[PDB]
Design an enzyme around this catalytic site. Structure first.
Site, mmCIF file in Angstrom:
data_model
loop_
_atom_site.group_PDB
_atom_site.id
_atom_site.type_symbol
_atom_site.label_atom_id
_atom_site.label_comp_id
_atom_site.label_asym_id
_atom_site.label_seq_id
_atom_site.Cartn_x
_atom_site.Cartn_y
_atom_site.Cartn_z
ATOM 1 N N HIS A 109 0.714 -1.368 0.066
ATOM 2 C CA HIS A 109 -0.010 -0.051 0.157
ATOM 3 C C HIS A 109 0.934 1.041 -0.122
ATOM 4 O O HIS A 109 2.201 1.272 0.005
ATOM 5 C CB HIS A 109 -1.000 -0.056 1.201
ATOM 6 C CG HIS A 109 -0.481 -0.083 2.464
ATOM 7 N ND1 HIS A 109 0.498 -1.156 2.919
ATOM 8 C CD2 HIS A 109 -0.186 1.198 3.379
ATOM 9 C CE1 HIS A 109 0.984 -0.560 4.195
ATOM 10 N NE2 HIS A 109 0.456 0.564 4.505
ATOM 11 N N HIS B 155 1.498 3.662 1.867
ATOM 12 C CA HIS B 155 2.035 4.536 3.289
ATOM 13 C C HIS B 155 3.333 4.464 3.095
ATOM 14 O O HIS B 155 4.117 3.808 2.330
ATOM 15 C CB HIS B 155 1.805 3.652 4.318
ATOM 16 C CG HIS B 155 0.482 3.739 5.215
ATOM 17 N ND1 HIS B 155 -0.097 3.013 6.079
ATOM 18 C CD2 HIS B 155 -0.301 4.830 4.996
ATOM 19 C CE1 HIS B 155 -1.138 3.521 6.592
ATOM 20 N NE2 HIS B 155 -1.211 4.874 6.017
ATOM 21 N N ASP C 36 6.102 4.317 4.792
ATOM 22 C CA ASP C 36 7.005 3.293 5.244
ATOM 23 C C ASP C 36 6.876 1.761 4.506
ATOM 24 O O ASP C 36 7.480 0.962 4.843
ATOM 25 C CB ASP C 36 6.652 2.966 7.036
ATOM 26 C CG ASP C 36 5.177 2.809 7.152
ATOM 27 O OD1 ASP C 36 4.300 3.373 6.307
ATOM 28 O OD2 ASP C 36 4.832 1.959 8.182
ATOM 29 N N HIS C 37 6.223 2.012 3.380
ATOM 30 C CA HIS C 37 6.260 0.811 2.346
ATOM 31 C C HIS C 37 6.498 1.156 1.233
ATOM 32 O O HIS C 37 7.044 0.506 0.571
ATOM 33 C CB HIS C 37 4.984 0.218 2.713
ATOM 34 C CG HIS C 37 4.595 -0.061 3.943
ATOM 35 N ND1 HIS C 37 5.091 -1.338 4.691
ATOM 36 C CD2 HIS C 37 3.884 0.567 5.299
ATOM 37 C CE1 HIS C 37 4.856 -1.191 6.006
ATOM 38 N NE2 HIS C 37 3.977 -0.253 6.380
ATOM 39 N N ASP D 221 0.751 -4.597 6.182
ATOM 40 C CA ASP D 221 -0.394 -4.086 6.859
ATOM 41 C C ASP D 221 -1.974 -4.103 6.493
ATOM 42 O O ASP D 221 -2.026 -4.138 5.305
ATOM 43 C CB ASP D 221 -0.178 -2.435 6.858
ATOM 44 C CG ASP D 221 1.207 -1.896 7.287
ATOM 45 O OD1 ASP D 221 2.073 -2.777 7.198
ATOM 46 O OD2 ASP D 221 1.351 -0.853 7.844
ATOM 47 N N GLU E 238 2.071 -8.755 10.183
ATOM 48 C CA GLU E 238 2.258 -7.590 11.018
ATOM 49 C C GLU E 238 1.816 -8.075 12.602
ATOM 50 O O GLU E 238 1.145 -8.874 12.638
ATOM 51 C CB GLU E 238 1.732 -6.394 10.660
ATOM 52 C CG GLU E 238 0.140 -6.245 10.771
ATOM 53 C CD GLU E 238 -0.264 -4.707 10.580
ATOM 54 O OE1 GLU E 238 0.528 -4.055 10.412
ATOM 55 O OE2 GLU E 238 -1.509 -4.680 10.719
ATOM 56 N N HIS F 119 6.748 -5.773 11.427
ATOM 57 C CA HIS F 119 6.470 -4.617 11.500
ATOM 58 C C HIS F 119 5.690 -4.350 13.065
ATOM 59 O O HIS F 119 4.341 -4.610 13.288
ATOM 60 C CB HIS F 119 5.084 -4.509 10.480
ATOM 61 C CG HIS F 119 4.544 -3.225 10.108
ATOM 62 N ND1 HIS F 119 4.012 -2.272 11.013
ATOM 63 C CD2 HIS F 119 4.460 -2.646 8.895
ATOM 64 C CE1 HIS F 119 3.861 -1.168 10.367
ATOM 65 N NE2 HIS F 119 4.123 -1.559 9.126
HETATM 66 ZN ZN LIG Z 1 0.989 1.000 6.756
HETATM 67 ZN ZN LIG Z 2 3.256 0.518 8.174
#
Ligand SMILES: [Zn+2]
Ligand SMILES: [Zn+2]
Lengths: 496, 590, 633
Positions: free
Chosen positions: B66, B68, B70-71, B176, B201, B407
């Site tokens: 996705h 975000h 952090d990805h 996530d 996660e 995660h």
């Molecule tokens: Zn995320």
């Molecule tokens: Zn994340």
């Protein structure tokens, strides 16, 4: 006549895929024999059945099944079909049509023993197929052919057979066996315990029905109905959404269950936090993917809450919180279920939350449903009655179109518990101790609203006409003259 | 065998990046940065995947869960400076959303850090030109043998699990995800794939999130009383994700209660967030995707673009604001503007970064920097992550055979591992960043087969002779390309080899006074009486047949007291032939 | 493998295929051509439709003046319009397992099959197909409703009278099985029986088969189906279009390597050039609007309408006709527009990029925002207030037998300036317009079609090289329009065996191999051995477990093959311990005598016989000695 002409035409044409197909389509499309000539037509068709290309034979069998609905045929057709099946083993389609015709004949009229339901059943059982030829259809055939009130062994083995389709066929046959009673054995419970985990759809969908139906018969395993209910609970989170509908409906229909285990569905909270401040299957089922399962959940909850006098108090918060669901259907169902379980229930602090909803845009259905709920709810604290009164007044002054229901809900809210309102009498209607209060307008639909409550409450408590001010007497006469289905007759001196 | 190397998120959070070596193929799941390490250590290490060579040589495909940061924050860095031309897979919403966030992060880095070696707008455009799109449940063939499948996740719009399958081996990476349905995103759903390995996660593995419906009930009660008291409402939430969920909830409640107080939404990211959430309806769960027919929930009737100058405006107000972390705080501007007043509320629906103004406000001290905060704060939790029950339910549904947690935090990792091992009897691990873990596979080789053999064998099994080993036999013809299992006779005809016949004829010696002429009749009668349910027949020529064993009264021998019986049989029925010879060695009844 | 064709229509097929132990039906086509034979359903009764003269049976025995009515020397029936159906009696549909949908046009007839027959199986279709199908069925139900024309002419249906009735009534097919339009409760039940599928989603049925929809490109969401076991392939192609269009481009890659190829839904007007004919559209529309008349356009509120709208959007500014507004009148206009807007992932790459650059993919959204084009539910209401002239009006139903088009065209027919422009190619516009003739309205026929033509068909057939090709007989036989032309009939090698309405065919295929999986323990246990170069074989022994039609083998009677050489026999006997063995030769075999136990063995070509005394230990020793001189099968 017509049958003979059709047979002659078919024989003359003798076209493999053309003549037979056209003749069959015309014969079926036009009309039924509507006479005893059905037997002659069947004999003629069986005569030509000795041919190739079993598609024509299948079409002929379909025509025979359609004709069997006329009820004219009886044992002649049965014997002919048995003979034909005894040697017509070719591919799966021909046996399929033959089994369908046999089922039609069996359930069409005879509904009797003595080679009317026993010989056919035995023949079908002996004709068990090797690869999905008839398996499902013979299963449902023996399903609709109930032997007697003494057969379950064969299906017992078939439960764990190859194809999930055949498993469903066996399940439906079992359902047909139950619907005629047949006093199903207990071992089916343990056998279907594994059926629950079949790891394929359309199987569990009816395995759940089977476990419910067997369980409800008698609760004796070690706890049997409680065990089955636990299984349904552990299943309520099935991957699909189609299963969960049956899951919810069936546990709702169930009625008897161990109390201590029942609350374990609802046990997880901010709700108990609020309760202190003032002083898991359903927990997840209530909030699910699409509103169908929510509707099923609320219905199951209302049913079993009705069943058990206890467990209601535990569910009032779970109902009321689920008002702002955004699906009007769920809204209405929640209001209806709260009404239906409204008895011996208290809203010590829930009053304000369930009344806040009374202000909807128009939501005429929702607001009317809330009035219906209030007229059948129960409150215990005087401040509760006062609060409900003030929110109802706000409702009336903002939506001056349902006063006609506001008045009735107030009437019931008074009659239900009169003594609660008696302390309010001096305060709610202004009665300044040593000042003569100016006559409030007679027709104002807030003053009428607050008067109807008092008058309805006054049937019970004899002492309160003392509290009644000067105007209230002539105003009572005027009301009792206008709205005779809201204020009952009283003992007032003015209207003896 | 399976090799898993977490280059990040190993008993930690941020910069998630996993490498999977499966059946000799290398796939890179997710590649993002994480804040807090201004050094290059934020980005995932690449000295292990390919050291200092060409990435495409070793890697096969990149997968993005996705959008975000952090990805999806390392895509330009990983694919432009380092150099990569291979396929990058990511769902249409992710592809449409990540570019804006990447550009914003690029601008923020320029404005705050100003790192010299930092990807540029042109380079982000070049990177995103190299993307490939995936719809729900669409199996995309990366090559002739490797295929990837997506699934609905709901961590944010477009988030998706991935099932990386080759042959029979398969690994399910969830990234996530959420299992509790939200007000605009449906819960994650999966098949019963039964993967060998499952990456998941644990961001909230130790917290059983309570009833979301009641939580939002409390939120709405607080906002209603706040608007009643005349105060103002400031809601800091980062522009993506939670902002739109709050907006939907408030808008629907607001239309129902018919309240009129205007409400404002922070500008800047609105013009893109709303547009994407409007053009991507077919991800936003049943309620919206149905109600779309009449109206479009994302065309907001009562939410309007915010204006800075309205901060001083009197009367009760409701305003969303950014960012949720308050580090820079356009929201913090209004917060400082109104801090003195005790009438206003503020809600923090998420975890703040420790050691920042977020933590200073989280703690209740008035002096937060030296300025004193007076208005009231409520620390709400509207996170869209997976609760312990959610993870347990998801693993139970997928029914895997081995799990792997990333995660999250190490201690929660440990609690979750202990619980899951005790519960589901499933292997678990805890790879620390940079630690490779190997797991054994079950590479069952496939094979072809002739239909008729199977058909008759299954008919025999259907017959009530089961539980007795029927010894499925035959032979496996191998071409190194198409292994095909065939029956004995079919293999004989296919290969052209002669059907060798092995015959044994045993001379049974019978020593009795009975006449030779009646010897064959005696043999027939004795065999029919002894061998029950055996095909025993007396041929017209005086011989006897037992199944396929032929017993013949030989010509008279030179010994008057000895009669010769030739028992002839084939190798296939040699068991019954030997049994017949042993029985006859005892002699005929006399 | 038996294939049943239950609909003679060349474009709206209904094919029941049988495969392994499963029965799969493809498409539910509603032949809406039959509706042409009925009179229009006016929105407000018009005197000319009311007072039409009655055709009379020449004999006069039957009272057919009421059933039949004549206009322009022609005949039409008089009742609520009707619809033809697939022949459902060939095989009990209840035994059908799975239904597949090609496109919204091919799923039009779904409710009849899904509800009435007792069908319990599942249905598969793509998301846009199901949504737009729910839109079209709603439109059709609304059109048939809203003016319930109760009359029911049934005497004419008789075959005997039908023979005498003049053309085209002589030409009707299966007049008996015609059925009245379904209703909304049936529609809801049908659409609720459905389940969804995305592109290339590999749906497995009981492990018995694996079905996959592939982008077709004809319209927004149309899918070509592929059914495969592990060793077969049946590619069912219905309505593809490799031209440049907005839907997702056609994928031919997976189509190749197909055992059986069912081909359907070719173009309707093979000679029509889409681009040039759209040019004719625009030119004629412009000329009429300049003349000042009014332009009417029948078209389904989906599909070709969107391409037409892009073209008109680009061309209007060419002549600067901004004054004349476009009215789009239909009870599903707004919903169709919004649904076209939302579906981005299914459009072409250009439009998907137009989405990634935040902007609504189609330009009719920009048109509506600009107010040139206005969409209205139906003529009654706001449209009446906000009407204008001159104008261009997109009506609802191109069958010309009902909807808003009938009213508009009864209104505007008298004039000559006004013009009706046909675009949907599915109906013979001659028969469509017959009832209203005479007409002063200028009739222009520019039927836009985008389906692949015969040349592209030949290209694709050569590219995929199928083992068999199955197509309707209409393609095989050259069209009646041009019997001279040869390009207008399909061509293939081997020739495409054809079919007709209500026909049964047996595919020239045989089931030989299927898929089974070994288990690693037994795989390791087995030891291959070789008899021929590159051929290593080993006898097998195990127990099969079958689940969901999936078979596997796990550990819990092979025979001999190969001659035994006598020289090796004696050599190994001597080196193992046997002694005093004497061998003599015969015509073709050898007789070897071992003195111990007096064992005589005759070895001939494919023949070995051992005779010894009453011995057991030596007998078994000989057995194990002789069996190990060959290969076990
Ligand atoms: Zn995320
Ligand atoms: Zn994340």
């Amino acid at each position: 006549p017509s049958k003979s002409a059709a047979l002659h035409i078919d024989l003359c044409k003798a076209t493999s895929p053309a003549d037979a197909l056209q003749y069959l389509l015309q014969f079926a499309r036009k009309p039924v024999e509507a006479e005893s000539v059905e037997g002659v037509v069947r004999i003629l068709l069986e005569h030509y059945y000795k041919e190739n290309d079993p598609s024509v034979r299948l079409k002929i069998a379909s025509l025979l099944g359609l004709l069997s609905k006329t009820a004219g045929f009886s044992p002649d057709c049965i014997m002919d079909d048995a003979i034909n099946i005894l040697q017509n083993e070719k591919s799966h389609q021909v046996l399929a049509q033959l089994l369908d015709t046999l089922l039609a004949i069996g359930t069409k009229l005879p509904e009797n023993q003595a080679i009317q339901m026993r010989l056919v059943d035995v023949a079908c059982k002996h004709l068990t197929d090797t690869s999905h030829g008839v398996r499902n259809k013979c299963l449902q055939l023996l399903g609709n052919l109930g032997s007697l009130e003494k057969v379950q062994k064969i299906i017992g083995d078939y439960f764990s057979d190859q194809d999930p389709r055949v498993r469903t066929a066996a399940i439906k046959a079992m359902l047909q066996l139950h619907e005629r009673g047949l006093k199903l054995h207990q071992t089916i419970y343990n056998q279907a315990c594994k059926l629950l985990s079949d790891d394929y759809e359309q199987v569990r969908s009816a395995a759940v029905q089977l476990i419910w139906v067997v369980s409800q018969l008698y609760p004796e395993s070690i706890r049997l109905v409680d065990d089955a209910f636990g299984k349904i609970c552990h299943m309520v989170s099935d991957g699909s959404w189609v299963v969960r509908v049956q899951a919810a409906k069936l546990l709702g229909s169930m009625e008897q269950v161990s109390s201590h285990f029942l609350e374990q569905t609802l046990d997880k909270t901010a709700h108990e936090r609020a309760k202190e401040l003032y002083s898991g299957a359903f927990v997840h089922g209530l909030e699910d993917e699409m509103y169908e399962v929510r509707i099923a959940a609320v219905e199951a909850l209302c049913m079993l809450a009705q069943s058990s006098p206890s467990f209601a108090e535990k569910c009032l918060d779970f109902l009321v919180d689920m008002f702002n669901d955004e699906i009007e259907e769920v809204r209405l169902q929640s209001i209806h279920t709260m009404r239906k379980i409204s008895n011996n229930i208290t809203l010590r602090e829930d009053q304000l939350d369930t009344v806040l909803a009374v202000l909807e845009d128009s939501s005429r259905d929702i607001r009317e449903a809330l009035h219906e709920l209030l007229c059948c709810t129960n409150v215990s604290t005087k401040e509760g009655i006062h609060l409900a009164l003030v929110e109802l007044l706000k409702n009336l002054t903002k939506y001056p179109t349902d006063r006609d229901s506001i008045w009735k809900c107030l009437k019931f809210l008074g009659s239900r518990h009169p003594t609660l309102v008696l302390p309010l009498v001096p305060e709610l209607l202004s009665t300044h101790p040593f000042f003569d209060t100016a006559e409030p307008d007679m027709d104002d639909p807030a003053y009428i609203a607050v008067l109807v409550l008092i008058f309805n409450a006054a049937k019970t408590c004899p002492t309160m006409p003392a509290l009644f001010s000067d105007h209230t007497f002539r105003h009572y006469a005027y009301l009792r003259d206008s709205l005779s289905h809201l204020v009952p007759a009283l003992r007032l001196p003015g209207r003896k | 065998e399976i090799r898993v190397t977490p280059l990040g998120a190993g008993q930690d959070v941020g910069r998630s990046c996993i490498l999977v070596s499966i059946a000799g193929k290398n796939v890179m799941l997710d590649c993002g940065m994480h804040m807090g390490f201004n050094d290059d250590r934020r980005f995932p290490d690449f000295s292990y995947i390919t050291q200092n060579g060409r990435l495409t040589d070793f890697l096969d495909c990149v997968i993005i869960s996705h959008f975000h940061l952090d990805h999806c924050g390392a895509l330009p860095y990983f694919s432009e400076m380092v150099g990569y031309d291979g396929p990058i897979y990511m769902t249409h919403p992710t592809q449409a959303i990540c570019p804006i966030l990447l550009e914003d992060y690029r601008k923020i880095a320029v404005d705050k850090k100003g790192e010299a070696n930092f990807f540029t707008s042109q380079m982000i455009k070049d990177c995103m030109k190299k993307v490939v799109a995936v719809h729900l449940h669409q199996t995309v063939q990366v090559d002739d043998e490797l295929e990837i499948k997506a699934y609905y996740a709901g961590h944010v719009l477009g988030a998706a699990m991935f099932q990386i399958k080759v042959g029979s081996e398969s690994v399910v990476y969830t990234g996530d995800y959420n299992m509790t349905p939200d007000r605009h995103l449906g819960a994650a759903w999966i098949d019963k794939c039964r993967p060998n390995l499952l990456i998941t996660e644990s961001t909230y593995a130790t917290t059983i999130r309570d009833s979301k419906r009641c939580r939002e009930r409390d939120f709405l009660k607080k906002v209603h009383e706040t608007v009643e008291r005349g105060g103002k409402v400031l809601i800091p939430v980062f522009a993506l994700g939670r902002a739109q969920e709050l907006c939907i909830l408030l808008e629907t409640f607001w239309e129902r209660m018919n309240l009129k107080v205007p409400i404002y939404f922070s500008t800047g990211l609105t013009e893109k967030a709303n547009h994407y959430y409007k053009l991507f309806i077919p991800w936003t769960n049943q309620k919206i995707r149905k109600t779309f027919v009449q109206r479009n929930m994302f065309e907001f009737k009562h939410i309007k673009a915010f204006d800075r100058a309205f901060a001083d405006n009197p009367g009760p107000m409701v305003v969303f604001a950014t960012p949720g972390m308050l580090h820079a705080g356009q929201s913090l501007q209004i917060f400082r503007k109104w801090a003195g007043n005790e009438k206003n509320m503020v809600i923090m629906p998420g975890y703040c970064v420790q050691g920042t103004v977020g933590h200073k406000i989280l703690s209740g001290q008035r002096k937060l920097e030296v300025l004193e905060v007076k208005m009231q704060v409520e620390y709400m939790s509207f996170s869209a992550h997976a609760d312990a029950k959610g993870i347990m339910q998801l693993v139970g549904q997928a029914e895997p055979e081995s799990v792997l947690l990333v995660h999250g935090e190490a201690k929660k990792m440990e609690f979750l591992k202990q619980k899951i091992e005790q519960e589901l009897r499933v292997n678990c691990y805890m790879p620390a960043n940079g630690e490779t873990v190997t797991l054994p596979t079950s590479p069952s080789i496939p094979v072809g087969i002739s239909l008729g053999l199977l058909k008759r064998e299954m008919a025999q099994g259907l017959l009530p002779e089961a539980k007795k080993p029927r010894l499925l036999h035959g032979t496996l013809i191998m071409k190194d390309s198409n292994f095909r299992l065939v029956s004995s006779e079919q293999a004989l005809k296919e290969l052209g080899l002669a059907e060798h016949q092995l015959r044994f004829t045993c001379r049974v010696h019978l020593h009795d006074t009975r006449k030779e002429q009646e010897t064959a009749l005696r043999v027939y009668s004795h065999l029919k009486s002894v061998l029950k349910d055996h095909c025993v027949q007396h041929l017209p020529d005086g011989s006897v047949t037992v199944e396929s064993v032929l017993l013949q009264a030989a010509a008279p021998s030179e010994d008057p007291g000895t009669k010769v019986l030739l028992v002839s049989w084939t190798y296939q029925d040699e068991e019954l032939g030997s049994f017949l010879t042993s029985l006859l060695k005892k002699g005929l009844p006399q | 493998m038996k294939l049943y064709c239950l609909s003679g229509h060349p474009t709206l097929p209904c094919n029941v295929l049988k495969f392994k132990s499963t029965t799969i039906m493809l498409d539910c086509g509603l032949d809406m051509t039959s509706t042409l034979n009925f009179l229009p359903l006016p929105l407000v009764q018009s005197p000319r439709l009311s007072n039409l003269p009655g055709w009379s049976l020449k004999d006069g025995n039957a009272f057919l003046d009421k059933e039949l009515k004549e206009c322009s020397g022609h005949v039409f029936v008089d009742s609520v319009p009707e619809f033809c159906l697939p022949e459902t009696e060939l095989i009990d549909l209840s035994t059908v397992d799975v239904i597949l949908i090609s496109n919204y046009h091919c799923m039009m007839a779904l409710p009849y099959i899904t509800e009435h027959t007792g069908f319990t199986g599942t249905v598969y279709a793509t998301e846009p197909t199901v949504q737009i199908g729910r839109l079209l069925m709603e439109e059709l139900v609304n059109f048939i409703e809203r003016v319930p024309k109760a009359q029911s002419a049934s005497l004419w249906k008789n075959k005997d009278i039908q023979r005498l009735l003049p053309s085209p009534l002589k030409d009707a097919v299966e007049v008996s099985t015609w059925r009245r339009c379904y209703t909304m409760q049936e529609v809801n039940s049908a659409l609720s029986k459905i389940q969804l599928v995305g592109y290339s989603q590999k749906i497995e049925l009981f492990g018995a088969v694996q079905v996959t929809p592939l982008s077709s490109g004809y319209a927004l969401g149309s899918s070509n189906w592929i059914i495969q076991s592990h060793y077969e392939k049946v590619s069912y192609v219905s309505g593809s279009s490799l031209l440049t269009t907005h839907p997702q481009p056609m994928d031919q890659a997976s189509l190749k390597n197909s055992d059986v190829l069912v081909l359907t839904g070719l173009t309707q007007i093979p000679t029509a050039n889409p681009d040039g004919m759209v040019g004719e559209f625009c030119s004629n529309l412009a000329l009429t609007v300049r003349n000042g008349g009014n332009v009417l356009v029948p078209c389904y509120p989906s599909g070709v309408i969107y391409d037409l709208l892009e073209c008109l959007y680009q061309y209007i500014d060419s002549a600067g006709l901004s004054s004349v507004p476009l009215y789009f009148i239909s009870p599903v206009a707004n919903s169709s527009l919004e649904f076209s807007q939302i579906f981005a992932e299914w459009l072409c790459h250009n439009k998907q990029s137009k989405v990634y650059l935040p902007e609504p993919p189609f330009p009719h959204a920009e048109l509506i925002q600009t107010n040139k084009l206005k969409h209205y539910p139906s003529i009654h209401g706001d449209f009446s207030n906000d009407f204008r002239q001159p104008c261009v009006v997109f009506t609802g139903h191109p069958s010309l037998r009902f909807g808003d088009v009938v009213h508009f065209m009864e209104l505007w027919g008298k004039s000559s300036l006004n013009t009706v422009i046909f675009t949907e190619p599915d109906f013979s516009y001659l028969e469509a317009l017959a009832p209203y003739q005479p007409l002063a309205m200028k009739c222009i026929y520019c039927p836009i079609d985008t389906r692949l033509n015969f040349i592209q068909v030949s290209k694709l057939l050569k590219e995929v090289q199928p083992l068999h090709v199955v197509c309707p007989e209409q393609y095989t036989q050259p069209p009646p329009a041009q019997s001279h032309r040869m390009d207008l009939m399909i061509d293939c090698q081997p020739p495409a065996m054809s079919y007709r309405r209500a026909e049964v065919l047996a595919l020239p295929f045989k089931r030989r191999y299927e898929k089974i999986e070994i288990m690693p323990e037994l795989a390791d246990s087995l030891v291959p051995m070789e008899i021929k170069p590159g051929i290593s074989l080993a006898t097998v022994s195990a127990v099969l477990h079958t689940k969901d039609n999936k078979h596997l083998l796990q550990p819990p009677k092979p025979l001999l093959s190969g001659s035994i050489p006598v020289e090796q026999f004696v050599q190994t006997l001597e080196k193992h311990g046997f002694s005093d063995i004497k061998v003599e030769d015969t015509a073709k075999g050898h007789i070897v005598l071992l003195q111990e136990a007096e064992t005589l063995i005759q070895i001939e070509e494919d023949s070995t016989h051992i005779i010894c005394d009453n011995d057991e230990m030596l007998r078994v020793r000989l057995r194990d000695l002789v069996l190990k001189f060959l290969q076990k099968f």
